[PDB]
Each structure stands twice: as structure tokens, then as C-alpha cells.
Amino acid sequence: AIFSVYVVNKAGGLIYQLDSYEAEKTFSYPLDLLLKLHDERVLVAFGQRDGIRVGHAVLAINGMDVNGRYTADGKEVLEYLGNPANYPVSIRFGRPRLTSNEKLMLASMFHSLFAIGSQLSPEQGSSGIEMLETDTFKLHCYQTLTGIKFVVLADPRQAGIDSLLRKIYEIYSDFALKNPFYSLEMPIRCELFDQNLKLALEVAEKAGTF
Amino acid sequence: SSELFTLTYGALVTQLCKDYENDEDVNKQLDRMGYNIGVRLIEDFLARSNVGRCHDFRETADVIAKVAFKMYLGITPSITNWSPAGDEFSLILENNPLVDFVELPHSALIYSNLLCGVLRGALEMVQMAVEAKFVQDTLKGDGVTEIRMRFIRRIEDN
Amino acid sequence: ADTVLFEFLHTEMVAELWAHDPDPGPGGQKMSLSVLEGMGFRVGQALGERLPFREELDVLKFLCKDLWVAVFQKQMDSLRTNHQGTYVLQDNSFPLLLPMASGLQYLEEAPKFLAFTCGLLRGALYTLGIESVVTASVAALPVCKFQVVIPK
Amino acid sequence: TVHNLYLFDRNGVCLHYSEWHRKKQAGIPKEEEYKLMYGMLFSIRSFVSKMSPLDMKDGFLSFQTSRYKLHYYETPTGIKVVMNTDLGVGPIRDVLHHIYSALYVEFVVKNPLCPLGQTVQSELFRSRLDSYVRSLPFFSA
Ligand SMILES: *C(=O)CCCCCCCCCCCCCCC
Numbered sequence: 020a021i022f023s024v025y026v027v028n029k030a031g032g033l034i035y036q037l038d039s040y041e042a043e044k045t046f047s048y049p050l051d052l053l054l055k056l057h058d059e060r061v062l063v064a065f066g067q068r069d070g071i072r073v074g075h076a077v078l079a080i081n082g083m084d085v086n087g088r089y090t091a092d093g094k095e096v097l098e099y100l101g102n103p104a105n106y107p108v109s110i111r112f113g114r115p116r117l118t119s120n121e122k123l124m125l126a127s128m129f130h131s132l133f134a135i136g137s138q139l140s141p142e143q144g145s146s147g148i149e150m151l152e153t154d155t156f157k158l159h160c161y162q163t164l165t166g167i168k169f170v171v172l173a174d175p176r177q178a179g180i181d182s183l184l185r186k187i188y189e190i191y192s193d194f195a196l197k198n199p200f201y202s203l204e205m206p207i208r209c210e211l212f213d214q215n216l217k218l219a220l221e222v223a224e225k226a227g228t229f
Numbered sequence: 230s231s232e233l234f235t236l237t238y239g240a241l242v243t244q245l246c247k248d249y250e251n252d253e254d255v256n257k258q259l260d261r262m263g264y265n266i267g268v269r270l271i272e273d274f275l276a277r278s279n280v281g282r283c284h285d286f287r288e289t290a291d292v293i294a295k296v297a298f299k300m301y302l303g304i305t306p307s308i309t310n311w312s313p314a315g316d317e318f319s320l321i322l323e324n325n326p327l328v329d330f331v332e333l334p335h336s337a338l339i340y341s342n343l344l345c346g347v348l349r350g351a352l353e354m355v356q357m358a359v360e361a362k363f364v365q366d367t368l369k370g371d372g373v374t375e376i377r378m379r380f381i382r383r384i385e386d387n
Numbered sequence: 388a389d390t391v392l393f394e395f396l397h398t399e400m401v402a403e404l405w406a407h408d409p410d411p412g413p414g415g416q417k418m419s420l421s422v423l424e425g426m427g428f429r430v431g432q433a434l435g436e437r438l439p440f441r442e443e444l445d446v447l448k449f450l451c452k453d454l455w456v457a458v459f460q461k462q463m464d465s466l467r468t469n470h471q472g473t474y475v476l477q478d479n480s481f482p483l484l485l486p487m488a489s490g491l492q493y494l495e496e497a498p499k500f501l502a503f504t505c506g507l508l509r510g511a512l513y514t515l516g517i518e519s520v521v522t523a524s525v526a527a528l529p530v531c532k533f534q535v536v537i538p539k
Numbered sequence: 540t541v542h543n544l545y546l547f548d549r550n551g552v553c554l555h556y557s558e559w560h561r562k563k564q565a566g567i568p569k570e571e572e573y574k575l576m577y578g579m580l581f582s583i584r585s586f587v588s589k590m591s592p593l594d595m596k597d598g599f600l601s602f603q604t605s606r607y608k609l610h611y612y613e614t615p616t617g618i619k620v621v622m623n624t625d626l627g628v629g630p631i632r633d634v635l636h637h638i639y640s641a642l643y644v645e646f647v648v649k650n651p652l653c654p655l656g657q658t659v660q661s662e663l664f665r666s667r668l669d670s671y672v673r674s675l676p677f678f679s680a
Pocket residue numbers: 270271274280281282283284289292293297298301302344347348351352355392615
């Protein structure tokens with residue numbers, strides 16, 4: 020499977036991005052989990068039971084979807100959870116969703132990471148990072164002669180990624196050869212690009228998981 | 230079987246009790262010495278058992294009782310008395326591991342206080358601030374030996 | 388108790404008490420590592436009673452075969468002696484010095500980690516009706532030799 | 540082929556640095572390379588954590604460029620064993636754990652005269668390490 024796609028500027032700016040893809044338990048006072056506020060979100064700092072894991076954020080209380088660090092009711096989540104008269108309470112946790120800005124940051128972070136990997140290379144004539152691996156995902160990167168990066172995240176077993184990258188390059192090429200003087204720091208909004216990229220993803224989704 | 234460690238520990242205690250006029254101080258040095266052992270021992274433990282970082286005081290208690298105590302003391306303590314918050318539990322031992330044979334016997338001295346330093350020192354090296362404390366000792370009339378384990382906070386990456 | 392527990396414990400013991408001496412002597416002069424050796428002696432005294440002879444030699448064969456195997460999981464590498472009560476027990480790979488070095492890098496401190504073991508041998512000899520003086524010597528880690536002198 | 544090896548603390552302190560086959564040297568002082576290497580490594584840990592669509596167990600395992608492959612192992616105590624090799628070398632996690640277990644723990648942690656949180660000075664550790672790495676089947680070029 021394919022998790023997501025990132026198209027980065029030569030300057031580290033995100034000009035295109037696409038994603039290709041929840042526990043609820045009743046608690047008494049006090050809670051079995053340690054919660055902390057992190058970047059306008061309430062996450063689980065410690066404790067792991069019945070589906071809930073450390074990095075999970077509070078998504079809803081008593082069936083009510085939470086609003087960042089506040090309650091659907093306007094009250095501060097951690098304050099509400101600090102009052103024993105509000106128990107029992109039903110809470111829903113899940114891997115938080117990346118914000119647009121977070122995506123911008125990560126894309127910029129990867130930009131410098133890529134360069135360093137090249138700079139700190141023990142062998143000459145080395146490119147930046149082409150493949151970064153994890154236990155849950157693999158990141159594949161292709162850099163154009165003009166410095167544009169096509170980043171694809173997928174299941175560690177997913178194959179036929181070389182063709183996907185090569186295909187995205189073609190699709191991008193059509194957008195470049197059609198928009199010769201288009202701003203480099205501006206996002207790729209062309210519907211043909213989006214649509215063609217979509218299809219390449221469908222194809223790749225069938226290259227098997229070997 | 231290790232009477233060496235137990236006998237050696239007995240000599241340490243004996244010595245310190247002579248060095249210090251007040252037992253409260255012996256408890257302090259034993260815990261500190263334990264701590265110095267714990268921050269080192271954690272490495273030996275991880276390299277031999279291959280356990281990963283924990284994220285729940287309950288899994289941490291299992292590793293401690295069923296894997297660590299077994300490996301270094303040839304025993305498997307019992308886990309009991311979980312506080313509702315889950316940030317507190319106890320280690321119940323049939324007897325007292327650091328003890329060999331002692332003379333009998335009102336003393337403020339916590340004979341096996343070294344253990345506590347080991348537990349807090351080791352756990353600290355894995356991002357967990359905990360207080361280890363003796364609340365029941367077979368050396369003092371109690372039925373069993375009980376160590377209370379309290380989670381204070383998770384240390385953050387620098 | 389696993390081997391590392393004693394190893395680490397011992398380490399904290401020399402660290403904390405290698406310079407300690409409450410019973411100095413003429414002019415306040417402290418006996419080098421006297422306390423550590425003192426503890427080794429008491430520990431050795433008990434091992435002498437709890438481990439499984441005709442002449443003196445048998446007593447020393449025991450330290451090299453039983454005591455060493457019980458404390459360091461290995462028999463003494465070599466046993467020498469001038470037939471005058473002075474013995475030389477040598478270990479070419481002494482456990483407490485193994486992690487440290489294979490040369491001279493830590494000689495300055497090496498001695499501090501032998502006091503206890505000398506006491507171990509002396510305490511073992513005592514229990515078996517033998518008064519003596521056990522000294523330790525390291526030229527280059529980890530090869531150290533323990534000297535046992537039985538006064539006449 | 541095995542290019543070089545880095546050992547890091549839970550605070551970025553460069554515990555140890557060894558080098559065998561490095562044809563391209565950073566254009567900077569090693570004191571700086573260590574900070575750069577760590578910063579990058581630390582960013583990867585953070586990056587990987589937010590990018591992953593699922594909760595992880597091991598986290599970052601390694602990356603590869605056009606010419607080399609970086610192997611990364613991290614213990615629950617913050618110790619990091621980082622090794623660079625040719626693209627040919629597979630996982631080798633057992634090797635990284637060996638460096639930590641059989642060499643660092645054994646000749647650094649078990650050496651009271653070896654301060655933690657600082658560049659290792661033990662000649663033994665250094666000898667044993669070098670000897671061990673030169674043994675690895677994929678050491679030569
Ligand atoms: C999860 O984060 C892993 C937890 C690892 C805990 C390790 C604790 C080791 C401490 C040693 C306890 C044994 C007693 C030794 C007798 C002196």
C-alpha cells in the first residue's frame with residue numbers, strides 16, 4: 020500500500036501533497052493514563068491499555084469530538100479531566116492527524132536531512148537520501164536535475180516504487196512543459212496533475228507487496 | 230546460588246554501621262551506592278534480555294519482577310496493590326534477597342536499602358523517575374518483604 | 388545472585404571506602420586499603436567454613452580450586468612456593484581487572500581493586516587455622532599475582 | 540565494505556568515532572561533524588515519528604543514498620550505534636547490538652574507570668572494537 024506523496028521545492032517548500040488513507044474507553048477518577056498538552060493537542064504521555072498508545076491524542080469526550088486542546092463545550096480538556104465530578108467519562112484516542120503546517124515543516128525538515136546525508140557521505144559522488152526505512156513505513160525519494168523532490172511513503176513491503184517515482188516525474192514534466200514560467204514556490208494546483216497522479220497510485224497499488 | 234554477594238553485602242552494611250553513628254545515614258549511603266550500581270546495571274540488563282523501552286507502569290512492573298529479579302537474584306517477586314491511578318504498585322518477596330544470616334536485633338536501618346537505589350537508578354536511565362521504598366521487611370517481623378514502587382514522571386529526551 | 392551484581396557492588400565498595408581508615412596509627416598514618424581488605428577477610432572467613440586436609444599445601448590447593456572457582460568461576464592459573472611458608476597465587480586473567488585493560492592504561496588505580504580479594508584469601512586461611520599476610524601485585528592488567536606469607 | 544562507525548549518548552555526546560574506508564571527508568572539523576551527524580539523526584527520529592501513518596515499535600532502521608547505507612540502532616537507554624556501509628550490506632541488526640553488548644557494555648560500562656557521558660578513553664574497548672569490525676564478513680572493499 021501507498022501512504023502518501025510529497026512534492027518538494029528546491030528550497031524545501033511543499034508544492035503538492037496527498038494522503039492515501041480509534042479506541043474508546045470509559046474512565047473513573049483518577050485516570051489510568053498520563054495526559055499532557057502538546058502543540059494544541061492532548062496526548063497520552065504514559066500508560067497503554069485497550070488500544071490506547073503513548074502518542075495518541077484525545078479526539079472526543081463522552082462522544083463529543085474535541086476541539087484541539089479544548090472541549091466541544093469550550094472548556095479546557097485537561098481541566099475537565101481534572102475534575103472528579105465529571106466522572107465516569109468516555110474518551111476516544113487515535114493517532115493525531117498532521118496539520119497543513121506540520122506537513123510544511125516535515126517537508127522542510129526532510130530537505131536539510133537529504134542534504135546532510137549527502138554531505139556526511141563517506142563515498143564521493145553521492146546523492147541525498149533515496150530510501151529511508153522504518154518498521155511501519157519506507158520513504159522513497161527521487162531528485163530531479165533541477166532539484167525537485169518526489170517523496171513517496173509506503174508499506175515496507177510495497178514494490179514497484181521506482182516506476183511510481185518515474186511516473187510522477189513524467190506527470191510533473193507535463194505540468195512544467197505546459198507552465199514554463201510558473202512560480203517555483205507556488206503550489207501545483209493543476210487538476211490534470213492531481214488526476215494523473217491519482218491514477219499512477221492506483222496502478223502502483225497493484226504492483227504487489229513483495 | 231550466590232552467598233558471595235550476600236556475604237559481601239553483609240560486610241558492607243556491618244562496616245558502614247560502624248562508620249556512622251546514626252543508622253539514618255547508612256540508609257542514605259546504601260541507596261546512593263545502589264543508585265551508582267543501577268545506572269550501570271541497566272545497560273547489562275538491556276544487552277542481555279533485549280527488552281525495549283516501556284510505556285506503561287504495568288509492563289515495567291512485569292519486566293522488573295519476572296525478568297530482572299529472576300536474572301540477578303534467581304527469584305520472581307509478586308506484583309500487587311495497584312493504585313487506582315496505576316502509578317503505584319508493590320513488589321512482594323517471600324524473603325529478603327540481600328540477606329544471609331544476621332544477629333538479632335529498635336533500628337532505623339533499612340538493611341536492604343541498596344536495592345531501592347538500584348531500582349531508581351536503573352529506571353531513571355530508561356526515562357522513568359520512580360521512588361522505590363521498603364514498606365515491609367521480613368527482617369523486622371513482617372510476614373513478607375514488600376517494596377513499594379511509585380511512578381513520579383517520565384523524563385523527556387534532551 | 389548473578390556474577391555482575393558482585394562485580395558492580397565490589398566496584399562501589401572500593402570507590403567509597405578505598406581511602407577510609409578509622410584506626411590509622413602512629414602519626415595518623417592510614418594503612419592502604421585496610422578497610423577493603425578487612426571486609427574481604429570477613430567474607431573470606433565465612434567462605435572458608437561453607438566450602439567443601441592433611442598438610443598446609445592442601446589448604447592452598449583448596450583456595451586455587453574451590454575458593455577461586457566459587458568466587459571467580461575459575462581455578463587459579465598457577466601455584467608457586469618457596470618451601471618457607473610464602474606462596475604465590477597467580478591469575479593471568481583476573482575478573483575484576485578484565486574490563487579495565489590489557490596493558491598499563493589503569494595501573495595507578497588497579498591496586499584498589501585487589502584489597503578485598505587479598506582479604507578473601509586471608510580470611511579463608513584464618514578459618515582453617517592459618518595466620519598470614521596476603522599481598523597483591525599488578526605489573527600489567529589483567530595479570531596479577533597474590534602473595535601469601537605464613538609466618539613460622 | 541565498512542566505512543565508519545559512530546556511538547552516541549542519550550544527549551548527543553559522541554561516545555566514540557572510528558573510521559576505515561572513507562574516500563569523502565566532510566569539509567569540517569570532526570567536533571562539528573559529530574554535532575551535525577547527531578542533529579540529523581535526532582531530526583530523523585522526530586520526522587519518522589510524525590510521518591508514520593501507524594504507531595511504531597522500532598522506529599528508524601536505516602537509510603541509503605546512491606553510494607552508501609546508514610545503519611542505526613538505539614537502545615532503551617539512549618545509546619546509539621550508527622554504521623555506514625556499501626549498499627550491499629543487509630540489515631545487520633545483530634552486529635549493531637553486538638557492538639553495544641559485547642564491546643560498549645563489556646569494556647566501558649563494566650569499567651568503573653570509564654566515565655559515562657564522555658568520549659571513551661579505554662584502549663581495550665578501542666582495540667576490541669576495531670578487531671571485531673575488521674572481522675565482519677562485509678568489512679573489506
Ligand atoms: C521498560 O522501560 C524496561 C524496564 C527495565 C527495568 C530494569 C530494572 C533493572 C533493575 C535491577 C533489579 C534487580 C535487582 C538486583 C539486585 C540488587
